[model samples]
Target: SGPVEVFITETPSQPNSHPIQWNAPQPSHISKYILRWRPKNSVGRWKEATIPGHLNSYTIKGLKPGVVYEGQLISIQQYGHQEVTRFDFTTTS
Candidate 1:
Protein backbone atom coordinates (compact mmCIF):
# COMPACT_ATOMS: atom_id res chain seq x y z
CA SER A 1 0.00 0.00 0.00
CA GLY A 2 1.05 3.64 -0.46
CA PRO A 3 1.91 6.07 2.29
CA VAL A 4 -0.87 7.54 4.39
CA GLU A 5 -1.54 11.27 4.24
CA VAL A 6 -2.15 13.13 7.51
CA PHE A 7 -4.31 16.25 7.48
CA ILE A 8 -4.66 18.71 10.35
CA THR A 9 -7.92 20.59 10.83
CA GLU A 10 -7.94 24.29 11.59
CA THR A 11 -8.99 25.19 15.14
CA PRO A 12 -10.42 28.31 16.67
CA SER A 13 -8.09 30.42 18.80
CA GLN A 14 -8.63 31.37 22.43
CA PRO A 15 -6.60 33.20 25.06
CA ASN A 16 -3.39 31.42 26.07
CA SER A 17 -4.46 28.36 24.14
CA HIS A 18 -3.45 26.12 21.25
CA PRO A 19 -5.21 23.15 19.73
CA ILE A 20 -4.52 20.93 16.74
CA GLN A 21 -6.67 18.31 15.11
CA TRP A 22 -5.43 15.79 12.57
CA ASN A 23 -7.06 13.19 10.38
CA ALA A 24 -5.46 10.01 9.10
CA PRO A 25 -6.13 8.47 5.75
CA GLN A 26 -9.08 6.16 5.38
CA PRO A 27 -8.91 2.35 5.64
CA SER A 28 -6.57 2.69 8.54
CA HIS A 29 -4.70 -0.45 9.64
CA ILE A 30 -2.96 0.97 12.64
CA SER A 31 -3.31 -0.20 16.22
CA LYS A 32 -3.10 3.23 17.82
CA TYR A 33 -2.09 6.86 17.29
CA ILE A 34 0.94 8.28 19.04
CA LEU A 35 0.95 12.04 19.46
CA ARG A 36 4.09 13.85 20.44
CA TRP A 37 4.76 17.41 21.52
CA ARG A 38 7.78 19.53 22.34
CA PRO A 39 7.46 22.91 23.96
CA LYS A 40 9.72 25.85 23.08
CA ASN A 41 11.05 25.92 26.62
CA SER A 42 12.03 22.25 26.56
CA VAL A 43 15.08 20.65 25.04
CA GLY A 44 15.17 18.29 22.10
CA ARG A 45 13.26 15.72 24.13
CA TRP A 46 9.56 15.31 23.41
CA LYS A 47 6.52 14.52 25.53
CA GLU A 48 4.30 11.81 24.15
CA ALA A 49 0.56 11.04 24.29
CA THR A 50 -1.45 8.20 22.87
CA ILE A 51 -5.03 7.85 21.76
CA PRO A 52 -7.32 4.99 20.82
CA GLY A 53 -7.10 3.30 17.46
CA HIS A 54 -10.18 5.10 16.21
CA LEU A 55 -9.17 8.55 17.41
CA ASN A 56 -7.76 11.09 14.98
CA SER A 57 -7.53 14.31 16.97
CA TYR A 58 -5.87 15.55 20.19
CA THR A 59 -5.39 18.65 22.28
CA ILE A 60 -2.49 19.78 24.46
CA LYS A 61 -3.48 21.77 27.51
CA GLY A 62 -1.71 24.08 30.01
CA LEU A 63 0.45 25.60 27.34
CA LYS A 64 2.04 29.00 27.85
CA PRO A 65 0.66 31.88 25.87
CA GLY A 66 2.61 33.02 22.82
CA VAL A 67 4.79 29.94 22.90
CA VAL A 68 5.73 27.89 19.90
CA TYR A 69 5.46 24.12 19.90
CA GLU A 70 6.46 21.27 17.62
CA GLY A 71 4.17 18.29 17.12
CA GLN A 72 4.05 15.01 15.20
CA LEU A 73 1.97 11.89 14.73
CA ILE A 74 2.91 8.22 14.52
CA SER A 75 0.72 5.43 13.28
CA ILE A 76 1.43 2.24 15.16
CA GLN A 77 0.80 -0.90 13.24
CA GLN A 78 0.95 -4.59 14.05
CA TYR A 79 4.40 -5.43 12.73
CA GLY A 80 6.08 -2.06 12.34
CA HIS A 81 5.64 1.70 12.64
CA GLN A 82 4.78 4.33 10.07
CA GLU A 83 6.86 7.42 9.39
CA VAL A 84 6.86 10.13 12.01
CA THR A 85 5.25 13.15 10.39
CA ARG A 86 5.85 16.58 11.89
CA PHE A 87 3.37 19.46 12.18
CA ASP A 88 4.95 22.69 13.42
CA PHE A 89 2.67 25.39 14.84
CA THR A 90 2.40 28.07 17.51
CA THR A 91 -0.08 28.88 20.26
CA THR A 92 -2.07 32.14 20.55
CA SER A 93 -1.23 34.66 23.24
Candidate 2:
Protein backbone atom coordinates (compact mmCIF):
# COMPACT_ATOMS: atom_id res chain seq x y z
CA SER A 1 0.00 0.00 0.00
CA GLY A 2 2.84 2.35 0.90
CA PRO A 3 6.42 2.68 -0.21
CA VAL A 4 8.71 -0.28 0.37
CA GLU A 5 12.38 -0.13 1.36
CA VAL A 6 14.69 -2.20 -0.84
CA PHE A 7 18.47 -2.59 -1.10
CA ILE A 8 21.22 -4.36 -2.98
CA THR A 9 23.32 -7.16 -1.53
CA GLU A 10 26.56 -8.05 -3.25
CA THR A 11 27.35 -11.69 -3.70
CA PRO A 12 30.94 -12.92 -3.55
CA SER A 13 30.04 -16.06 -5.42
CA GLN A 14 28.85 -13.96 -8.32
CA PRO A 15 31.19 -10.99 -8.40
CA ASN A 16 29.80 -9.85 -11.71
CA SER A 17 26.33 -9.49 -10.29
CA HIS A 18 24.52 -8.28 -7.19
CA PRO A 19 21.29 -9.40 -5.58
CA ILE A 20 18.53 -6.97 -4.67
CA GLN A 21 17.12 -7.74 -1.24
CA TRP A 22 14.50 -6.26 1.03
CA ASN A 23 12.85 -7.16 4.33
CA ALA A 24 10.28 -4.42 4.70
CA PRO A 25 6.63 -5.30 4.98
CA GLN A 26 4.57 -5.12 1.78
CA PRO A 27 0.87 -5.31 1.05
CA SER A 28 -0.61 -8.57 -0.20
CA HIS A 29 -2.11 -6.78 -3.15
CA ILE A 30 1.29 -6.61 -4.84
CA SER A 31 1.37 -8.91 -7.84
CA LYS A 32 4.97 -8.72 -8.94
CA TYR A 33 8.27 -6.87 -8.66
CA ILE A 34 10.12 -5.45 -11.63
CA LEU A 35 13.87 -5.00 -11.51
CA ARG A 36 15.90 -2.90 -13.89
CA TRP A 37 19.65 -2.31 -14.03
CA ARG A 38 22.19 -0.51 -16.18
CA PRO A 39 25.66 0.93 -16.13
CA LYS A 40 25.61 3.99 -13.91
CA ASN A 41 27.12 6.38 -16.45
CA SER A 42 26.12 4.68 -19.66
CA VAL A 43 23.27 5.58 -21.94
CA GLY A 44 22.11 2.09 -22.70
CA ARG A 45 18.90 0.15 -22.46
CA TRP A 46 18.25 -1.10 -18.96
CA LYS A 47 18.20 -4.81 -18.25
CA GLU A 48 15.09 -6.10 -16.52
CA ALA A 49 13.75 -8.93 -14.43
CA THR A 50 10.15 -9.61 -13.42
CA ILE A 51 9.67 -11.48 -10.17
CA PRO A 52 6.82 -12.68 -8.03
CA GLY A 53 5.91 -10.40 -5.16
CA HIS A 54 6.27 -13.23 -2.66
CA LEU A 55 10.01 -13.29 -3.32
CA ASN A 56 12.21 -10.86 -1.46
CA SER A 57 15.36 -11.06 -3.61
CA TYR A 58 16.61 -11.38 -7.17
CA THR A 59 20.06 -11.64 -8.68
CA ILE A 60 21.07 -9.18 -11.39
CA LYS A 61 23.72 -10.71 -13.59
CA GLY A 62 25.84 -10.10 -16.70
CA LEU A 63 27.57 -7.03 -15.35
CA LYS A 64 31.00 -6.00 -16.49
CA PRO A 65 33.82 -6.16 -13.97
CA GLY A 66 35.03 -2.95 -12.29
CA VAL A 67 32.02 -0.96 -13.43
CA VAL A 68 29.35 0.94 -11.54
CA TYR A 69 25.72 0.01 -12.02
CA GLU A 70 22.37 1.50 -11.06
CA GLY A 71 19.33 -0.58 -10.21
CA GLN A 72 15.66 0.16 -9.66
CA LEU A 73 12.88 -1.89 -8.13
CA ILE A 74 9.19 -1.48 -8.89
CA SER A 75 6.13 -2.94 -7.27
CA ILE A 76 3.16 -3.88 -9.44
CA GLN A 77 -0.34 -4.10 -8.03
CA GLN A 78 -3.76 -4.76 -9.48
CA TYR A 79 -4.23 -1.08 -10.18
CA GLY A 80 -0.81 0.24 -11.08
CA HIS A 81 2.97 0.01 -10.61
CA GLN A 82 5.14 2.13 -8.36
CA GLU A 83 8.85 2.51 -7.90
CA VAL A 84 10.10 1.02 -4.68
CA THR A 85 13.76 2.02 -4.54
CA ARG A 86 16.98 2.72 -6.38
CA PHE A 87 20.46 1.50 -5.57
CA ASP A 88 23.97 1.36 -6.99
CA PHE A 89 26.78 -1.18 -6.84
CA THR A 90 30.12 -1.99 -8.42
CA THR A 91 31.27 -5.28 -9.79
CA THR A 92 34.59 -6.87 -8.87
CA SER A 93 37.16 -8.13 -11.34
Candidate 3:
Protein backbone atom coordinates (compact mmCIF):
# COMPACT_ATOMS: atom_id res chain seq x y z
CA SER A 1 0.00 0.00 0.00
CA GLY A 2 2.93 2.32 0.73
CA PRO A 3 6.61 2.57 -0.15
CA VAL A 4 7.68 -0.51 -2.12
CA GLU A 5 10.50 -2.03 -4.19
CA VAL A 6 13.28 0.26 -3.05
CA PHE A 7 16.85 -0.28 -4.29
CA ILE A 8 20.04 1.23 -5.78
CA THR A 9 21.98 0.44 -8.91
CA GLU A 10 25.57 1.19 -9.94
CA THR A 11 26.19 2.20 -13.52
CA PRO A 12 29.62 1.08 -14.68
CA SER A 13 29.51 3.30 -17.76
CA GLN A 14 29.05 6.45 -15.70
CA PRO A 15 31.14 5.43 -12.75
CA ASN A 16 31.42 8.69 -10.88
CA SER A 17 28.50 7.60 -8.71
CA HIS A 18 25.27 5.64 -9.05
CA PRO A 19 21.53 6.02 -9.27
CA ILE A 20 19.10 5.27 -6.49
CA GLN A 21 16.03 3.61 -7.92
CA TRP A 22 12.67 2.50 -6.63
CA ASN A 23 9.17 1.49 -7.64
CA ALA A 24 5.47 1.78 -6.86
CA PRO A 25 2.85 4.03 -8.35
CA GLN A 26 1.79 7.36 -6.98
CA PRO A 27 -0.44 7.12 -3.99
CA SER A 28 -3.58 9.05 -3.48
CA HIS A 29 -2.22 11.05 -0.57
CA ILE A 30 1.33 11.60 -1.71
CA SER A 31 2.36 15.13 -2.52
CA LYS A 32 5.78 14.32 -3.94
CA TYR A 33 8.98 12.30 -3.56
CA ILE A 34 12.30 13.66 -2.35
CA LEU A 35 15.80 12.25 -2.41
CA ARG A 36 18.45 13.92 -0.28
CA TRP A 37 22.09 12.98 -0.25
CA ARG A 38 25.49 14.27 0.81
CA PRO A 39 29.06 13.20 1.27
CA LYS A 40 29.30 10.61 4.03
CA ASN A 41 31.51 13.01 5.94
CA SER A 42 29.27 15.42 7.79
CA VAL A 43 29.27 18.92 6.27
CA GLY A 44 27.33 21.39 4.16
CA ARG A 45 23.71 20.99 3.09
CA TRP A 46 22.21 17.80 1.73
CA LYS A 47 21.50 17.98 -1.99
CA GLU A 48 17.82 17.43 -2.56
CA ALA A 49 15.81 16.38 -5.57
CA THR A 50 12.18 17.15 -5.30
CA ILE A 51 10.43 14.68 -7.54
CA PRO A 52 7.05 13.56 -8.73
CA GLY A 53 5.76 10.12 -7.80
CA HIS A 54 5.60 8.85 -11.36
CA LEU A 55 9.35 8.42 -11.79
CA ASN A 56 11.16 5.46 -10.26
CA SER A 57 14.72 6.72 -10.26
CA TYR A 58 17.18 9.61 -9.94
CA THR A 59 20.87 10.01 -10.76
CA ILE A 60 22.91 11.95 -8.24
CA LYS A 61 25.14 14.64 -9.68
CA GLY A 62 28.29 16.36 -8.46
CA LEU A 63 29.91 13.11 -7.48
CA LYS A 64 33.46 13.37 -6.25
CA PRO A 65 35.79 10.55 -7.10
CA GLY A 66 36.23 8.03 -4.28
CA VAL A 67 34.15 9.92 -1.76
CA VAL A 68 31.46 7.91 -0.01
CA TYR A 69 28.05 9.52 -0.05
CA GLU A 70 25.09 8.26 1.96
CA GLY A 71 21.53 9.36 2.29
CA GLN A 72 17.89 8.37 1.93
CA LEU A 73 14.78 8.85 -0.18
CA ILE A 74 11.57 10.06 1.33
CA SER A 75 7.94 10.10 0.35
CA ILE A 76 6.09 13.31 1.03
CA GLN A 77 2.43 12.71 1.54
CA GLN A 78 -0.50 14.71 2.83
CA TYR A 79 -0.19 13.06 6.21
CA GLY A 80 3.57 13.54 6.71
CA HIS A 81 6.97 12.66 5.33
CA GLN A 82 8.22 9.09 5.41
CA GLU A 83 11.76 7.81 4.85
CA VAL A 84 11.37 4.89 2.45
CA THR A 85 14.88 3.87 1.55
CA ARG A 86 18.55 4.47 2.35
CA PHE A 87 21.61 4.33 0.11
CA ASP A 88 25.41 4.49 0.20
CA PHE A 89 27.68 4.97 -2.80
CA THR A 90 31.29 5.82 -3.61
CA THR A 91 32.40 7.08 -6.98
CA THR A 92 35.10 5.46 -9.08
CA SER A 93 38.06 7.62 -9.96
Candidate 4:
Protein backbone atom coordinates (compact mmCIF):
# COMPACT_ATOMS: atom_id res chain seq x y z
CA SER A 1 0.00 0.00 0.00
CA GLY A 2 1.34 3.38 -0.99
CA PRO A 3 0.50 6.59 0.81
CA VAL A 4 0.90 9.98 -0.83
CA GLU A 5 1.19 13.44 0.61
CA VAL A 6 -1.39 15.65 -1.12
CA PHE A 7 -0.82 19.35 -1.13
CA ILE A 8 -2.53 22.37 -2.66
CA THR A 9 -0.40 24.12 -5.24
CA GLU A 10 -2.56 26.93 -6.59
CA THR A 11 -3.82 29.86 -4.59
CA PRO A 12 -5.84 32.92 -5.52
CA SER A 13 -6.21 31.18 -8.80
CA GLN A 14 -8.29 33.30 -11.12
CA PRO A 15 -11.80 33.80 -9.80
CA ASN A 16 -12.28 30.13 -8.93
CA SER A 17 -10.02 27.10 -9.04
CA HIS A 18 -8.70 24.12 -7.05
CA PRO A 19 -5.21 23.00 -8.03
CA ILE A 20 -3.20 20.46 -6.05
CA GLN A 21 0.20 18.76 -5.87
CA TRP A 22 1.78 15.72 -4.20
CA ASN A 23 5.16 14.42 -3.00
CA ALA A 24 7.10 11.10 -2.93
CA PRO A 25 6.93 8.09 -5.16
CA GLN A 26 3.53 7.21 -6.57
CA PRO A 27 1.72 4.00 -5.82
CA SER A 28 2.58 0.98 -7.88
CA HIS A 29 -1.01 0.10 -8.62
CA ILE A 30 -2.93 3.28 -9.04
CA SER A 31 -5.87 3.73 -11.39
CA LYS A 32 -7.24 7.19 -10.86
CA TYR A 33 -8.03 9.92 -8.33
CA ILE A 34 -11.16 11.53 -6.87
CA LEU A 35 -11.69 15.18 -6.12
CA ARG A 36 -14.66 16.56 -4.19
CA TRP A 37 -15.00 20.27 -3.68
CA ARG A 38 -17.70 22.64 -2.40
CA PRO A 39 -18.23 26.14 -1.28
CA LYS A 40 -18.16 27.12 2.40
CA ASN A 41 -21.07 27.99 4.74
CA SER A 42 -23.83 27.41 2.24
CA VAL A 43 -25.92 24.79 0.52
CA GLY A 44 -23.37 24.30 -2.23
CA ARG A 45 -23.20 21.17 -4.30
CA TRP A 46 -20.18 18.91 -3.96
CA LYS A 47 -18.35 18.94 -7.29
CA GLU A 48 -16.26 15.88 -8.03
CA ALA A 49 -13.71 14.64 -10.55
CA THR A 50 -12.02 11.40 -11.55
CA ILE A 51 -8.42 12.03 -12.57
CA PRO A 52 -5.82 9.77 -14.07
CA GLY A 53 -3.44 7.96 -11.71
CA HIS A 54 -0.31 9.36 -13.35
CA LEU A 55 -1.61 12.83 -12.76
CA ASN A 56 -0.39 14.28 -9.49
CA SER A 57 -2.42 17.47 -9.54
CA TYR A 58 -5.83 18.48 -10.94
CA THR A 59 -7.11 21.98 -11.22
CA ILE A 60 -10.81 22.68 -10.78
CA LYS A 61 -12.10 25.62 -12.69
CA GLY A 62 -15.20 27.79 -13.30
CA LEU A 63 -16.36 27.76 -9.69
CA LYS A 64 -18.40 30.55 -8.17
CA PRO A 65 -16.32 33.61 -7.68
CA GLY A 66 -15.61 35.32 -4.33
CA VAL A 67 -16.59 32.32 -2.23
CA VAL A 68 -14.65 30.06 0.09
CA TYR A 69 -14.31 26.52 -1.14
CA GLU A 70 -13.27 23.20 0.37
CA GLY A 71 -11.82 20.20 -1.40
CA GLN A 72 -11.22 16.52 -0.63
CA LEU A 73 -8.83 14.16 -2.34
CA ILE A 74 -9.04 10.38 -2.67
CA SER A 75 -6.57 8.16 -4.40
CA ILE A 76 -8.20 5.52 -6.52
CA GLN A 77 -5.82 2.63 -6.32
CA GLN A 78 -5.78 -0.33 -8.63
CA TYR A 79 -7.28 -2.41 -5.84
CA GLY A 80 -9.59 0.19 -4.35
CA HIS A 81 -10.07 3.81 -3.46
CA GLN A 82 -8.29 5.21 -0.42
CA GLU A 83 -9.08 8.30 1.60
CA VAL A 84 -6.51 10.96 0.81
CA THR A 85 -6.74 14.48 2.26
CA ARG A 86 -8.69 17.72 2.60
CA PHE A 87 -7.96 21.37 1.83
CA ASP A 88 -9.84 24.68 1.95
CA PHE A 89 -9.38 28.08 0.33
CA THR A 90 -11.25 31.13 -0.87
CA THR A 91 -11.75 32.04 -4.53
CA THR A 92 -10.92 35.70 -5.05
CA SER A 93 -12.90 36.72 -2.05
Q: Which ten residues in a row have the lowest lDDT in candidate 4?
A: 22-31
Q: In angstroms, give how far residue 90 of model 4 lies from its true place.
A: 2.6
Return the TM-score for each candidate structure. 0.72, 0.80, 0.71, 0.72
Q: For model 4, what is the C-alpha lDDT against the true structure?
A: 0.69
* Per-residue lDDT of candidate 4, residues 9-92 (tens digit): 666566666566765354476566787787877756677888777677777887877777787776666676565666676666
- Least accurate stretch of 10 residues (summed lDDT) in model 3? 1-10
TM-score of predicted model 1? 0.72
Each prediction's whole-model lDDT (CA): 0.65, 0.72, 0.70, 0.69
Give per-residue CA lDDT, model 2, range 1-93, as digits (tens): 545677556756577667668654545766678887888897678788898877888787777778888877777777775646666767777
Candidate 2, which segments miss by more than 4 Å at Cα?
Answer: none
Runs of candidate 1 with Cα error greater than 4 angstroms are 1-10, 13-17
Task: Quote the positional error of residue 57 for candidate 3 in Å.
Answer: 0.8
The TM-score that candidate 4 achieves is 0.72
Q: How accurate is candidate 1 locally (lDDT)?
A: 0.65
> In lDDT terms, which candidate is top?
2
Q: How do these models rank on TM-score, best leading? A: 2, 1, 4, 3
Candidate 3 per-residue C-alpha lDDT over 1-93 given as tens digits, one digit per residue, 9 for 90 to 100: 356566656666466656767776545666567887888998778788887877777787667777788877777777775646666766666
**CA lDDT of 88 in candidate 3?**
70
User: Can you write out model 1's per-residue Cα lDDT over 1-93, one digit (the tens) per residue?
Assistant: 123455544377563455566666556566677777787676787778787766656676666666777777777776675656776677765
